[PDB]
């Protein structure tokens, strides 16, 4: 017999207490492939995070029902999706995150794009499911020609996210990633920051508030790097193209994936953003002999830039543990309002066993495909007892619910607007 559907009381309980479980997958948008028997590791290393208060709540519920600490521990493996390459275990003991430092894609795989696959279950072998990263583009190696904006794929738009790493003399053990920790920038061996790269116009002054411009990042432009987690920023920088061990002052072609970059601290005396072991400092460049358009920079001042992405999934066991995996987790991108009032949901991983709930009111739902659903908007009187029309605006949460009670929250609300 089928499992219990979500009750209105269970929905009300969730809406008060919350306790969502969230899986984040942070990773680069491209990856260089490996030939033969070699291993060219994904850099930065994909990082899985277990976010939100629901992990601790689930852990306590499980141990209440008689699980040991080890039985309640989440486990996770990661691999190339749809692939013969083996999965690799992630160690999450004592942490809510783990990086995958030795992934690579062999040229045995002929795909042009792929996804990472994260398989999760608890210590008592209770299943959680399989979570997919965003799509990752395979490259053979970065081109040496100037980047064309026709390949928007490999360019970097203002306001998107990048990682930055430094590596000394081709040694994998020396890789260090720009990262913010304890209110300070540092260069980490194990953790990496995902930084907004904001384009500023040339006359934009220093400050914490600044006007950002749209477009693709080019060498010679002024940029602001902002940690997407801490909000900490660096002073204004001029991103310059690295050629051998010199920064080119006159290059102005588009920045491309995996290019080597230098960051000149704007309005300084040839000071460049520079690592020294784990320390982040500024280090003065040396003028090149005869050539006035290049400056010699420190080993620590050359940074590989790479665009990064984020997959995020949120679920809640609204009627308790279930037999089916909670995956694939639906994600709602947008709501659009459309006889009867219909609300259209656009996103991914929709299934015909989902229903849209407005607040605690389950709505009639029409499945179309994995990216599109329609539902009928409940009468306002389902939320305001006497109203025969919308007297004042009324805002309710929009939530996806599966037929076995799994609850998939959205960040999105619906607002009944008064009739003018």
């Amino acid at each position: 017999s089928p499992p219990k559907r979500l009750t209105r009381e269970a929905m009300r309980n969730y809406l008060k207490e919350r306790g969502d479980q969230t899986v984040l997958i942070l990773h680069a948008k491209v990856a260089q492939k490996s030939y033969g028997n070699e291993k060219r590791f994904f850099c930065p290393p994909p990082c899985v995070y277990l976010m939100g208060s629901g992990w601790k709540k689930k852990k306590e519920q499980m141990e209440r029902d008689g699980c040991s600490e080890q039985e309640s521990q989440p486990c996770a493996f990661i691999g190339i999706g749809n692939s013969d390459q083996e999965m690799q275990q992630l160690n999450l003991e004592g942490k809510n995150y783990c990086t995958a430092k030795t992934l690579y894609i062999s040229d045995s795989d002929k795909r042009k794009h792929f996804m990472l696959s994260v398989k999760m279950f608890y210590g008592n072998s209770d299943d959680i499911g399989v979570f997919l990263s965003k799509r990752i583009k395979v490259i053979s190696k970065p081109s040496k020609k100037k980047q064309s904006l026709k390949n928007a794929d490999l360019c970097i738009a203002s306001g998107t996210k990048v990682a930055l790493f430094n590596r000394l003399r081709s040694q994998t053990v020396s890789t260090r990633y720009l990262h913010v920790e304890g209110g300070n920038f540092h260069a980490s061996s194990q953790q990496w920051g995902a930084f907004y790269i904001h384009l500023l116009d040339d006359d934009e002054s220093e400050g914490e508030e600044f006007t950002v411009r749209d477009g693709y990042i080019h060498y010679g432009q002024t940029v602001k790097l902002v940690c997407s987690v801490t909000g900490m920023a660096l002073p204004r920088l001029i991103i310059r193209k690295v050629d051998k061990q010199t920064a080119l002052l006159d290059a102005d072609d588009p920045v491309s994936q995996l290019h080597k970059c230098a960051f000149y601290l704007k309005d300084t005396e040839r000071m460049y953003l520079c690592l020294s072991q784990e320390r982040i400092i500024q280090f003065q460049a040396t003028p090149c002999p005869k050539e006035q358009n290049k400056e010699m920079i420190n080993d620590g001042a050359s940074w590989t830039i790479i665009s990064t992405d984020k997959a995020e999934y949120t679920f809640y066991e609204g009627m308790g543990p279930v037999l089916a995996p909670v995956t694939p987790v639906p994600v709602v991108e947008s709501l659009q309002l459309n006889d009867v009032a219909m609300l259209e949901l656009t996103g991914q991983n929709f299934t015909p066993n989902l229903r849209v709930w407005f607040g605690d009111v389950e709505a009639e739902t029409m499945y179309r495909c994995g990216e599109s659903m329609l539902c009928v908007v409940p009468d306002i009187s389902a939320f305001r007892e006497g109203w025969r029309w919308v007297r004042q605006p009324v805002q309710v949460p929009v939530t996806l619910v599966r037929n076995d009670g799994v609850i998939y929250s959205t960040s999105l609300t619906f607002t009944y607007t008064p009739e003018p």
């Binding site: 306001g159 209110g183 400050g207 600044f210 006007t211 909000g231 920023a233 953003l273 500024q282």
Partner: peptide, 14 residues
Amino acid sequence: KKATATTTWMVPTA
């Protein structure tokens, strides 16, 4: 079309 950095870190010198 305007961003808000929470804090701007000072970069120490060599």
